[PDB]
């Protein structure tokens, strides 16, 4: 009884893939950011996403693979072979794989649906959920490039973003 | 004046790698410590190493290259396709890896003498001290397996290796 | 036994010079900063950087030599006969005499190995740190005048730096 | 209206070479204090002497020029070539040095009224002030080599006078 | 890989017994110094030496030796068969022992950059710098029995010295 | 009067001796329990006793000489020419080591009555108590090798006995 979904499995197996290649791009970006693009404060705000892709994003599917029986997958490649030409474009770019991310997962909750597997159901609400939330953080930046042509006018708004403290909101948080 | 080493940076974007593609290999051995060997202690210590590898040793890097001009390469590739047959072998095989870094960081200082770059002898003294420190640690657990044939015993000083409060060596930590 | 190595007596009397020298090249560019260019916080930073090149960079070499036998020289010439233009041009200035201290500490380190004068070796290790250090204080500075055409959003910026609670990185600081 | 004085604006560029250059000779002092005739005491008391006249000494003159529209000039020269020939005679040399200072404010002081400057006359006060307040805590010093023939009692009450809570006299101070 | 270096191995179990045997002599010099000499602060000072001989100066080796693989040798032979005649030559033995410590240090760390032994020159820098510092407290005493002929005049000098609280400068500390 | 007796400086010089080459042996074995037999905690234990006889055992002596008269010789041998081959017999060389102290201790006991030296008498009841304390501490860490066959278990509880909060038994602590 309760035997693992396979189909699901492979599904999280390749969330995980997608989100440790994404962290590591990011890790990238955000050096670029500073040291190609000159704004420190974007290039803070494109780390602490790099690092969130790669802890609890990927922490919670290897953990949730203990409690169930799925088998964890590690196989990983990713090369950065080039970069946007200018911050706002590097942010944009930020923003194109964060909004896959939300199609992703759209897709392994439509499947644990499928396969009435309301353990995975549940435990997808959580990207479901984080799905909206780092894209609304990453389309804050965005904007700001559409908003003055000044980059130290946008450094200081990042800088305030990325050292506001931490607030969830009560739904998307 | 002061043009940066092209073989030093060679070097340095292949340790990068290196500390990259170890820490994702070190997440996956952490998951079945916990998961195949039932030693979530074990997987604990692994995990730790693992973010160790994927945090300061590649950021320091990273940070490195914007002060001086060197490029840094992001080019990721690993999968882990077969795990060691039992928990002692595990660790074992963090010990190898772990005398390669030794090794790896010897030749750059090495080649950063016979360039004259000082600042990068500098620098990799922090890693010329890591990688006795971090092999120590990992020496730590591998004695376990020797001392005991109980897993929970293992397990039990394990444990308070990883949740003994931060204490370094004078010279070494 | 241990007798003091003439030929890095000579290169520690000639830094010493050149802090002494550059302290006060700095002491007047922070004057001018303020007064001709409008840009008080440019000129704290730059007072800041002065004080630091006639304070410790200096004392600790004064105090090597008294404990090693090394005969400590004083004799020094700088006339401020022309400044940059502008700030920008300014700040580059500074950059570029960073970048100087840079390539005269490499040589001094060279020599210490040459000479197999181990104490000096080990006493230049701060400066081969700090060289890099200050340069990247001082990149950071540069980096603004890129950044923003407006005086006042800049001043901001360094505003914030140089009141900034020190925080010394692990490895530059 | 309210031009600023030429004469003025000369006699501070000049007095701020001075306490420039006597700083400078004030720190080799001190080195040889320690080091040539074992008095660190003493050598703190010439040190603390020397960032006094390369600190708010020459600060004040810069700060005040930019607010009168004064230019500043920096052109120092100055090497130490011979030295006393022992502690009693290093500290009358600072003695007739600081006495000299009292009679270069003094002419600024005169100048000053001359010229119906009265924002220039109430500026040098603190320098006719600090004349003497300099001399006085030379002079103290002076008086030891001539109570005690007993270089470590003399290094005591020096200690004490460098390592008493700073206490300024109503009107000296 | 990683062998260890039977070069280094050798040199350090020869400077292991050094500073036993050091240590033991210091010994039985602060017991001479109160005794024979009546200066009990003299002797604390040397005692303290002594201490550090025999506690940090050995405990770090034998701590990097289980961390390598090299074997610790333990072979003691010291005996005081004579004493200098005063205080004042006993410190001076002390300071020529002291300074025979930098010249055994120095080749240690020339002979670790011969072997590519990066580690152990990295492990002896503490020993480099410590080298220094100790001669300079030693060398502190010294000056002491040459600016006064009173020992209760240098006790108490030197009872200040070993009662402060432990202040270690930046590089030397 | 109150001549300092003969026989009695000799036993005391001779225990004095015992003690610095037990103590250096000590230091061999806790290096060795720790790097050979995988016990550091065994190591710990040990290494606390090396610095007891190295520390307060000699010191005593060194001070009561001072009181009374009597010479101290610093004359020392020991090298560590082969080892226990495991833990046990390590632990067991060091009982059979204490239980000599005791024999020795109560020789100068002896002596000390016979030449009505109740000063010395006095002095070496702190040898005499601490003759049976030693003995009975390591006697306690022997007993866990007979108790069990599982080192890590062994080494739990040594751990808590070296890190144990001092608490000296009204009579014999
Ligand atoms: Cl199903
Ligand atoms: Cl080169
Ligand atoms: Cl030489
Ligand atoms: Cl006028
Ligand atoms: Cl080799
Ligand atoms: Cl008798
Ligand atoms: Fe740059
Ligand atoms: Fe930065
Ligand atoms: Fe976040
Ligand atoms: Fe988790
Ligand atoms: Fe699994
Ligand atoms: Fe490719
Ligand atoms: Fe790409
Ligand atoms: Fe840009
Ligand atoms: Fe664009
Ligand atoms: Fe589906
Ligand atoms: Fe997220
Ligand atoms: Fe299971
Ligand atoms: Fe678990
Ligand atoms: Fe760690
Ligand atoms: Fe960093
Ligand atoms: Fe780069
Ligand atoms: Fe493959
Ligand atoms: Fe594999
Ligand atoms: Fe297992
Ligand atoms: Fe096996
Ligand atoms: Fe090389
Ligand atoms: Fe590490
Ligand atoms: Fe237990
Ligand atoms: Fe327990
Ligand atoms: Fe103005
Ligand atoms: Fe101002
Ligand atoms: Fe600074
Ligand atoms: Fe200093
Ligand atoms: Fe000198
Ligand atoms: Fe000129
Ligand atoms: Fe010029
Ligand atoms: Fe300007
Ligand atoms: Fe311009
Ligand atoms: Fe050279
Ligand atoms: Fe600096
Ligand atoms: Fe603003
Ligand atoms: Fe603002
Ligand atoms: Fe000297
Ligand atoms: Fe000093
Ligand atoms: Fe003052
Ligand atoms: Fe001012
Ligand atoms: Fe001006
Ligand atoms: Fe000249
Ligand atoms: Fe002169
Ligand atoms: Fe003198
Ligand atoms: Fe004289
Ligand atoms: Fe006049
Ligand atoms: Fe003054
Ligand atoms: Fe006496
Ligand atoms: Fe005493
Ligand atoms: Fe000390
Ligand atoms: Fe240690
Ligand atoms: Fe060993
Ligand atoms: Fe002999
Ligand atoms: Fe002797
Ligand atoms: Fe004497
Ligand atoms: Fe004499
Ligand atoms: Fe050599
Ligand atoms: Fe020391
Ligand atoms: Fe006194
Ligand atoms: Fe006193
Ligand atoms: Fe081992
Ligand atoms: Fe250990
Ligand atoms: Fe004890
Ligand atoms: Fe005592
Ligand atoms: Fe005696
Ligand atoms: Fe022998
Ligand atoms: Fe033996
Ligand atoms: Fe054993
Ligand atoms: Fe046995
Ligand atoms: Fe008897
Ligand atoms: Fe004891
Ligand atoms: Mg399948
Ligand atoms: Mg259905
Ligand atoms: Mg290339
Ligand atoms: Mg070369
Ligand atoms: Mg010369
Ligand atoms: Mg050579
Ligand atoms: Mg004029
Ligand atoms: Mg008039
Ligand atoms: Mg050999
Ligand atoms: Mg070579
Ligand atoms: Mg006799
Ligand atoms: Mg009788």
């Not at 492979?10 to 990011?26: C, R, T």
């Not at 309301?118 to 490039?145: A, M, N, P």
Request: no cysteine; aromatic share 10%.
């Amino acid at each position: 009884i309760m035997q693992k979904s396979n189909k699901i499995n492979d599904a999280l197996n390749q969330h995980y893939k997608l989100n440790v290649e994404l962290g590591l791009v990011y890790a990238h970006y955000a050096h670029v950011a500073d040291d190609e693009f000159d704004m420190p404060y974007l290039g803070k705000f494109i780390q602490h996403l790099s690092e969130d892709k790669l802890g609890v994003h990927k922490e919670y599917i290897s953990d949730y693979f203990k409690r169930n029986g799925m088998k964890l997958k590690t196989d990983v490649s990713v090369a950065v072979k080039s970069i946007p030409s200018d911050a706002k474009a590097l942010i944009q770019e930020v923003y194109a794989r964060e909004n896959e991310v939300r199609d992703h997962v759209k897709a392994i909750a439509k499947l644990a649906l499928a396969e009435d597997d309301y353990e995975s159901f549940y435990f997808i609400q959580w990207y479901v959920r984080d799905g909206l939330k780092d894209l609304t953080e990453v389309d804050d930046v965005v904007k700001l490039f559409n908003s003055s042509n000044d980059k130290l006018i946008i450094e200081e708004t990042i800088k305030e973003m990325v050292e506001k403290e931490e607030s969830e909101h009560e739904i998307w948080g």
